[PDB]
């Protein structure tokens, strides 16, 4: 419900009530003007897609991607707002309301509405065995030349294969992950940020979509 699309900037602590300290991730949630929505009448899933931070004008000589293009020009002219950089589905909520071309708000929530968080990982390059998966290393002394490699992979020749799904050294990777049931300690309106509880994925100046919980 009301999937805002903020980005992080860091993490600090905020003293709650009587003595309680709770660590807080501060999520900068800039402008979010709703682009076209799609329903069951058109082709079959009721959803609201949302934009995020804008960029400059269109079609001069696009060296970068902070300039738009004739695809995203007419796709964003339809709602008569500036062209965008991050467009995300929300098939969670509310096919009825949310008129097209509406800024959403920042205060859809209250200080106590539980949320979820979807964001990409850090990604730590190509890393090996006992750092990626929870495997334990070998003995570092008494003569053993088996310090840190993964062990055996399969049996002898009554299974002449190695079974796929084997947890071998590959890339650590940034793939998506969703924590569940975080809460909001405080909402700001004027500086246009919110806060959450604990810590969410996705390193600084990243991207994170948040939405209501499913408890």
């Amino acid at each position: 419900t009301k999937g805002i699309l903020g980005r992080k900037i860091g993490m600090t602590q905020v003293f709650g009530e009587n003595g309680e300290l709770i660590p807080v991730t501060v999520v900068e949630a800039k402008e979010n003007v709703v682009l076209q929505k799609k329903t069951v009448e058109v082709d079959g899933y009721n959803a609201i897609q949302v934009g995020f931070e804008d960029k400059k004008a269109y079609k001069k000589d696009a060296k970068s991607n902070k300039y738009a293009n004739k695809p995203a020009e007419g796709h964003a002219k339809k709602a008569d707002a500036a062209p965008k950089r991050f467009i995300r589905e929300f098939r969670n909520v509310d096919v009825d309301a949310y008129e097209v071309g509406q800024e959403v708000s920042v205060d859809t929530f209250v200080a106590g509405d539980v949320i979820d968080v979807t964001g990409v990982s850090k990604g730590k390059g190509f890393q090996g065995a006992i750092k990626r998966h929870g495997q334990s290393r070998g003995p570092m002394s008494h003569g053993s030349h088996f310090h840190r490699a993964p062990g055996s992979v399969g049996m002898a020749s009554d299974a002449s294969r190695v079974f796929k799904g084997q947890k071998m050294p590959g890339r650590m990777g940034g793939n998506t992950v969703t924590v569940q049931n975080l809460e909001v300690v405080q909402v700001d309106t004027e500086n246009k940020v919110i806060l959450v509880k604990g810590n969410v994925p996705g390193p600084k100046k990243g991207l994170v979509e948040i939405r209501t919980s499913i408890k």
Binding site: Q13, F15, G19, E20, L21
Partner: protein, 122 residues
């Protein structure tokens, strides 16, 4: 933390002076400990006299471990000595005159005969 085979200058007036922990009893595969748990332990040193004698497996609460404890406001209590109190298996000590200032955290776990029998409690 205090784990499998630590050695603890016990604080009671009941004859033991140093004990060593066999197991940190709790859940299955329990490894670590901190203030308020209960460990089973066998004495090594023994004061002449006292109550208990050398080589007698007794159960004993933990008090004031070396690393801190995080109470829920943001404080920390780091002591400077691992210590212990031998319990009677009714959550009360053996002797009377336990030394060595005690952390407040062992109160929800109904150890309140130790706290009233003690010097300065934080």
């Amino acid at each position: 933390m205090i784990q499998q085979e630590t050695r603890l200058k016990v604080a009671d007036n009941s004859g033991a002076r140093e004990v060593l922990t066999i197991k940190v009893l709790g859940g299955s595969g329990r490894k670590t400990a901190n203030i308020g748990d209960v460990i089973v332990c066998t004495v090594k040193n023994a004061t002449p006299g006292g109550v208990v004698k050398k080589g007698d497996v007794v159960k004993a609460v933990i008090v004031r471990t070396k690393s801190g404890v995080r109470r829920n406001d943001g404080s920390y209590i780091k002591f400077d000595e691992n210590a212990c109190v031998i319990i009677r298996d009714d959550k009360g000590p053996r002797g009377t005159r336990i030394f060595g200032p005690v952390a407040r955290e062992l109160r929800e776990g109904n150890f309140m005969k130790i706290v009233s029998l003690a010097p300065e409690v934080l």
